[PDB]
Design a protein around this ligand. Sequence first.
Ligand code: 017
Lengths: 99, 99
Amino acid sequence: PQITLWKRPLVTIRICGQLKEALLDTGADDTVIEEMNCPGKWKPKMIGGIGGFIKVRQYDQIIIEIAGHKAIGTVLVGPTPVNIIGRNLLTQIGATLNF
Amino acid sequence: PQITLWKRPLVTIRICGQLKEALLDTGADDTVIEEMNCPGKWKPKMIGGIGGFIKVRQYDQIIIEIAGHKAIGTVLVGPTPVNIIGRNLLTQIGATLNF
Ligand SMILES: CC(C)CN(C[C@@H](O)[C@H](Cc1ccccc1)NC(=O)O[C@H]1CO[C@H]2OCC[C@H]21)S(=O)(=O)c1ccc(N)cc1
């Protein structure tokens, strides 16, 4: 599909059996998902943006479906105000920015 | 151009006379640039990102060239970790996400 940018580029994702809304974010290196009790081993991480840093849990090889496209990779879980699909998974669903 | 997302989507911009590197950021509503000298009037504002809120100077109707494409619009100037081109200007240059 083609997504114009008049509005936030939100899509439906499925992660750990739950449907969520997430922002397709070319400015994010990594995918960051709102706090949820996913199973699996993790490593702590700090990620920084406007305002400073948040502490997150880094999970590797997590399966996510994004707007119907399957993906698998690193997902950071923590107190983000929005769910963000970053470049690590955008590349897997074939996303490009065009102008 | 068509921009893939293996690497950060960095471009050269010209703003208030000066060349800077900036990140094309579909997850940003607004364009936020590091502290710099711009001429003319500004309004104090706040904006929040992943780590909290910062104070910025809002400049309106600023002429800004983005990878050779013209835009004229609002720029927030303040202590951002990365210069980001948000949707307010991405729409002006005709950017879309495609997958
Ligand atoms: C600042 C960027 C270099 C990186 N950010 C992604 C960015 O797209 C965020 C993504 C974002 C979106 C909403 C809320 C928080 C963070 N947007 C953002 O800060 O935009 C601000 C400017 O416009 C406003 O519109 C949204 C918030 C304001 S980030 O959220 O801080 C971030 C950093 C590291 C990772 N792995 C993932 C995300």
